[PDB]
């Protein structure tokens, strides 16, 4: 009635990081070598990592060395798997398995497995922003909305840097979709709405994206 259970799976962007934990029940992990294995969508199993007793030996599959790290916590019976610089082929169901038997020999099979946790790695590591105008409806206010980009940062100028007075670029917000959104506004004299042109320049270096958008008072 030995039991194991993983936690920490989920969705990750290409190049991101994700840490998985593994807890146990009705035995202690100190005496056992602990392993991480993954079932790829193709259906086959693939050995990921192994940590020996007292963390003397830490072994990784060739496809994950330099990117993955396995750790153990014997006093509280936990195992950890850090995955950095994640690739699309890292998408799999990750199980935490124990090496053991009725008597502990020097090389026993995987007699206990956890139910596994799903780890999905989306291919898109970056996304360019969509830029929409905030049209001026004395003093008028105008701007542009820079929405749905990943990751930070995004820089915004006005008229290639000519217009600096009265400009407010707000800090980015993290939307419930996982993409960032910000808005940049400027205060201008109303009379200048007909003559002076207003262009906001949005630069997103992670995607090498450059968008110049001008803003009108609409018809």
């Amino acid at each position: 009635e030995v039991q194991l259970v993983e936690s920490g799976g989920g969705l990750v962007k290409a190049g991101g990081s994700l840490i998985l934990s593994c807890g146990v029940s009705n035995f202690r992990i100190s005496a056992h070598t602990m392993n991480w294995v993954r079932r790829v969508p193709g259906g086959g199993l693939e050995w990921v990592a192994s940590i020996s007793t007292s963390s003397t030996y830490r072994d990784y599959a060739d496809a994950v060395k330099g990117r993955f790290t396995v750790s153990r916590d014997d006093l509280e019976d936990f195992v950890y798997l850090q995955m950095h610089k994640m690739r699309v082929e890292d998408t799999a169901i990750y199980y935490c398995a124990r090496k053991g038997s009725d008597r502990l020999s020097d090389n026993d099979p995987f007699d206990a497995w956890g139910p596994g946790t799903v780890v999905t790695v989306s291919p898109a590591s970056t996304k360019g922003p969509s830029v929409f105008p905030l049209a001026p409806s004395g003093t008028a206010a105008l701007g542009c909305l820079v929405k749905d980009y990943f990751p930070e940062p995004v820089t915004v100028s006005w008229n290639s840097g000519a217009l600096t007075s009265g400009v407010h670029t707000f800090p980015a917000v993290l939307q419930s979709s996982g993409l960032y959104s910000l808005s940049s506004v400027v205060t201008v004299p109303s009379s200048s709405l007909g003559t002076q042109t207003y262009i906001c320049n949005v630069n997103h270096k992670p995607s090498n994206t450059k968008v110049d958008k001008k803003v009108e008072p609409k018809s």
């Binding site: 392993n35 050995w47 199980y95 090389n107 995987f110």
Partner: protein, 213 residues
């Protein structure tokens, strides 16, 4: 490094049969081999270790034998519960390696898929998303190939597939491939096509539609 290769990749048989799955090692591993059973969405269960030793609780209809570079797992008298994937593993002191897996399925006659294509609904379309669905209904064997063509341009990386298990009645499979696009990208093209390749077909079947009609 030792590489474990299973044979076959898919093994079709009937209830009551006696089946054998072979596991071949590139190098001699003596009896450092294990056999595991795994069903979809579940954890792998250890069936056999040290080539031939049956773990306590495993039914006697399972057996394993072999050594060095040749290993066999025999199920004598297949029951319905025995249909699953079977993995052989060479386990070392601080590392391990698995085979590709052998899926044991219900044997049946080859069946061609009935192919259907569904354009995106207007309700979804005006919300900003266009999902174009392609359905392959009741085919056998499981291996099928679906390619999307948009204005004769082959698509890559914008579609997701989903396969059913063997249907309890006819022992066939069904597959659905969804090509998802933004409303703008969908409005930017005309003809959408699903091309299906399957052994039960003499040639690829192409179902298409023009955006609008």
């Amino acid at each position: 490094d030792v590489v474990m290769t299973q044979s076959p990749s898919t093994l079709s048989a009937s209830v009551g049969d006696t089946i054998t799955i072979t596991c071949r090692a590139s190098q001699s591993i003596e009896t450092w081999l294990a056999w595991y059973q795994q069903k979809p969405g579940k954890a792998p269960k250890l069936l056999i270790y040290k080539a031939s030793t049956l773990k306590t609780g495993v039914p006697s209809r399972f057996s394993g034998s072999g050594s060095g570079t040749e290993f066999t797992l025999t199920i004598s008298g297949l029951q319905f519960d025995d249909f699953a994937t079977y993995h052989c593993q060479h386990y070392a002191g601080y590392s391990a390696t698995f085979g590709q897996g052998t899926r044991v399925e219900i044997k049946r006659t080859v069946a061609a898929p009935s192919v259907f294509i569904f354009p995106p609904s207007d309700e979804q379309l005006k919300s900003g998303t266009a999902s174009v669905v392609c359905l392959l209904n009741n085919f056998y064997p499981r291996e099928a190939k679906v390619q999307w063509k948009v204005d004769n341009a082959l698509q890559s990386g914008n579609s997701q597939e989903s396969v059913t298990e063997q249907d309890s009645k006819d022992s066939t499979y069904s597959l659905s491939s969804t090509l998802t696009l933004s409303k703008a990208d969908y409005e930017k093209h005309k003809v959408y096509a699903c091309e299906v390749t399957h052994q039960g077909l003499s040639s690829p079947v192409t179902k298409s539609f023009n955006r609008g009609e």
